[PDB]
């Protein structure tokens, strides 16, 4: 009898660890069933896929920079001197059964992970979920975006191919060596000397697989622990007040819905990792300081920084026999953007003047200023992301070769203002649409 | 609250309500999905859910089969088995993604068509604690501090702060004391003693009068022997990536020569682009203060490393005499001492003086008159 066995196991568990009171509270937890509340579920599920596929990749990856001669099965690269990182990356794709499938799934999972965070960030931003008491959860989440910002960048550079090798020379060195007073000291401490050095990949590999994921896992655990004990908010509606949660219980509606949603994420990621080819490293060969690939092609999560570099004017300062290159503006801009993003609720509660407990999500149309600001930020981010494909864009109108950066350099003040005005007017119109 | 006697006769329906009441959960609405059993619509829905679940099992079995019995080895382009190899990875993701996607689809359709609809309201006790847990925890923490009498013992408190601070400063200083390296510690032997890494490159003479050839790479740089360059080894309107090669560096036939040649290619400031301007274009040529006599006739030598962020600029338009860096799209007017015209570049590319030795192969007349590569705080 299966029922008898379950009763015996339940009696044994209860008589040892008396979890009946604690388990019942967990099973009775109520979560809202809004569609936009699954945005954070995708980011968490994508992180799990990255954990599983990342462990598989470490069984065949050598993070060494030692020069070796290729001797695999790839004809076009036979006899080409390369590093151990590039050779083992080629070994995974070609000489390991299913290695290419896992490698493409892992890269696709990283993109979905990064995309989900940004889309989930907008949901928190637009609905005003960063208010009290969830102000500290925004800070923890903001740090997770920054950690995932560099985590994807480091992993993309692990194969040490020509494309990624140029992105660790254009960003991790020129911008780091261009910092005032203590700029070449950091570059020396992070590469162990000059570029490329011999401890670039091994140091990044240790950071990328363990140290950064360890902080991310700890922050995610604290993030999920907060939301579980903060009794996640809900949209205003019939029967929804500030002192109640309307939705479904964990067992069995939420558990099945949440668990089956994990299956779709794996299925979508698995389908994209087999049918869609991403990051073909064998086409351009190993990274060499002598030769160069056309672009420093990054993924879209770490692409807005490259667009800002090209669009920013060549402004440099030379105070008293020194040099402040153009890369300082990009690095400073990242600091200002990250600082503003992290301390957003604290600024909002200073200008709006409200410091009361909030549990019902604000409608985005109810706050036209915040909605317009968010739309302006999204439009600015999209323009910066699309600013680094100017090579393709230039060969579309054939009116001037250097006029594509002028569109970008002028459009950084005109287009965001246009989006801000349209969003502001649309929010007001929607307020009076049903009133 | 109820005793064991009452719980004996309680049904499962009211037992769930009692459990929710303790936790503050009130199930205000719950209805079975199919009010009438045995209807054809319910039976049809059961088959549809089972069909999705059975698809996952069939696709899961296919994944095991395609992984084992299928040509997976890499095949060269244009081969008899190249087409089969190109379908290996897509079949791996098609039979795996669809196997679990259909399972998730079937499970969701099961909880939207068979698990009864329920909406439950849980009273959230947000805000401050009910004034009895607040006072007790405040007294518990205050009693520990007041009972320990640490506040009234200043000598112990000051020593603890200084002792922990001194230990922390030493520990943190000894924890990040191995990562700090002086960037200006003379380590590269040059003609004049030892200089720092940034001030030097592959073209820096190790002794007075050292001969460095603008050698061309027969194949891939660092993997093929370097060959010397004749002045007329490039037609008017071309470009060659020369590297600093010495006569003692060998041709890579030995391990010590191969290591020397590898370091030449791995040099971040080593590559230099050689450009020859047509004789009918020297009227519109502007020199640089200090580099007026650096060119040799119609031959100009400029570093391949971009001055903005260090990307090796390989693209070059012979029609406009423009050097294009492919990373951030910066053009460098070769006629105006490789000065950056457009883009984020702000400093002109360094010019390497060149001349001709007794033999006749292009040699470097000396070192750069300015640091090569991206600018830093201590530059110029």
């Amino acid at each position: 009898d299966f029922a008898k066995l379950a009763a015996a196991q339940g009696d044994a568990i209860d008589s040892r660890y008396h979890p009946s009171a604690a388990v019942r509270r967990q099973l009775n937890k109520v979560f809202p069933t809004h569609w936009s509340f699954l945005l954070g579920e995708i980011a968490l599920y994508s992180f799990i896929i990255l954990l599983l596929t990342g462990v598989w990749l470490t069984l065949f990856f050598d993070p060494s920079m030692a020069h070796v001669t290729y001797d695999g099965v790839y004809q076009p690269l036979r006899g080409v001197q390369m590093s151990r990182a590039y050779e083992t990356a080629l070994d995974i794709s070609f000489e390991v059964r299913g290695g290419l499938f896992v490698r493409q799934v892992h890269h696709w999972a990283a993109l979905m992970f990064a995309a989900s965070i940004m889309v989930h960030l907008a949901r928190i931003f637009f609905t005003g979920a960063f208010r009290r008491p969830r102000e500290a959860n925004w800070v923890i989440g903001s740090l997770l975006l920054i950690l995932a910002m560099f985590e994807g960048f480091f992993g993309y550079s692990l194969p040490d191919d020509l494309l990624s090798g140029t992105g660790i020379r254009a960003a991790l060195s020129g911008i780091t060596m261009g910092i005032p007073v203590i700029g070449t000291w950091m570059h020396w401490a992070l590469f162990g000397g000059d570029f490329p050095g011999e401890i670039l990949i091994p140091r990044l590999y240790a950071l990328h697989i363990l140290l950064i994921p360890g902080i991310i896992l700890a922050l995610i655990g604290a993030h999920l622990a907060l939301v579980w004990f903060q009794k996640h908010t809900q949209f205003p509606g019939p029967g929804r007040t500030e002192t109640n949660v309307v939705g479904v219980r964990v067992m069995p509606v939420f558990a099945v819905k949440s668990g089956a949603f994990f299956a779709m994420i794996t299925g979508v990621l698995g389908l994209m990792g087999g049918l869609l080819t991403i990051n073909p490293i064998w086409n351009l060969g190993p990274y060499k300081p002598s030769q160069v690939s056309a672009g420093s092609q990054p993924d879209f999560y770490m692409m807005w920084t490259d667009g800002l570099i090209r669009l920013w004017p060549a402004w440099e300062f030379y105070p008293f026999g020194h040099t402040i290159p153009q890369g300082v503006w990009v690095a400073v801009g990242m600091g200002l953007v990250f600082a503003l993003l992290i301390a957003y609720p604290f600024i909002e509660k200073k200008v709006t003047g409200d410091d009361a407990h909030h549990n019902l999500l604000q409608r985005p149309r109810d706050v036209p200023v915040r909605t317009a600001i968010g739309s302006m930020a999204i439009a600015l981010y999209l323009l910066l992301t699309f600013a680094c494909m100017n090579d393709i864009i230039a060969l579309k109108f054939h009116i001037s070769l250097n006029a594509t950066t002028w569109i970008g350099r002028i459009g950084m003040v005109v287009l965001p203002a246009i989006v801000y005005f349209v969003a502001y007017r649309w929010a007001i119109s929607l307020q009076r649409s049903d009133r | 609250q109820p005793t064991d006697a009452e719980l004996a006769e309680m049904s499962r329906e009211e037992l769930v309500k009692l459990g929710g009441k303790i936790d503050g959960v009130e199930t205000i609405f719950k209805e079975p999905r199919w009010p009438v059993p045995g209807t054809k619509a319910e039976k049809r829905t059961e088959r549809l859910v089972a069909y999705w679940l059975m698809l996952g099992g069939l696709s899961g079995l296919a994944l095991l089969l395609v992984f084992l019995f299928w040509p997976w080895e890499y095949q060269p382009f244009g081969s008899e088995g190249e087409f089969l190899y190109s379908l290996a990875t897509p079949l791996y993701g098609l039979t795996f993604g669809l196997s679990i996607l259909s399972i998730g689809i079937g499970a969701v359709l099961f909880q939207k068509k068979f698990i009864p609809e329920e909406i439950s309201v849980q009273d959230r006790h947000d805000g401050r604690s009910p004034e009895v847990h607040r006072k007790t925890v405040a007294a518990n923490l205050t009693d520990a501090l007041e009972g320990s009498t640490l506040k009234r013992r200043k000598v112990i408190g000051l020593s603890l702060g200084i002792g922990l601070g001194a230990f922390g400063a030493g520990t943190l200083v000894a924890f990040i004391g191995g990562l700090i390296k002086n960037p200006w510690k003379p380590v590269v032997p040059t003609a004049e003693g030892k200089k720092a890494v940034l001030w030097t490159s592959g073209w820096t003479p190790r002794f007075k009068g050292e001969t460095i050839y603008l050698a061309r790479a027969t194949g891939r740089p660092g993997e093929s022997p370097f060959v010397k360059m004749r002045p007329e080894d490039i037609d008017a309107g071309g470009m060659e990536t020369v590297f600093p090669w010495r006569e003692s560096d060998g041709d890579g036939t030995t391990v010590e020569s191969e290591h020397k040649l590898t370091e030449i290619a791995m040099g971040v400031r080593n590559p230099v682009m050689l450009i020859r301007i047509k004789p009918a274009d020297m009227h519109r040529v502007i020199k640089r203060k200090g580099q007026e006599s650096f060119n040799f006739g119609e031959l100009f030598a400029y570093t391949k490393v971009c001055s903005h962020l260090g990307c090796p600029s390989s693209l070059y338009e012979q029609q406009t005499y423009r050097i294009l860096c492919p990373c951030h799209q910066s053009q460098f007017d070769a006629l105006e001492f490789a000065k950056p015209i457009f883009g984020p570049a702000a400093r002109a590319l360094a010019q390497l003086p060149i001349t001709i030795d007794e033999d006749g192969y292009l040699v470097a007349n000396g070192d750069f008159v300015e640091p090569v590569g991206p600018a830093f705080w201590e530059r110029k």
Binding site: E316, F317, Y318 | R206, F207, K208, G209, E210, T211, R246, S248, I286, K287, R288, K289, G290, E292, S293, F294, N295, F296, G297, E336, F337, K339, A346, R347, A348, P353, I354, T355, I356, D357, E358, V363, N365, E370, K380
Partner: peptide, 25 residues
Amino acid sequence: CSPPGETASSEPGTTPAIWTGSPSP
């Protein structure tokens, strides 16, 4: 601002001499 050590000049220049090559490397 503009780079101080980067100024154009109108000096014509002279043809470089033949390199000799010092001995004793």
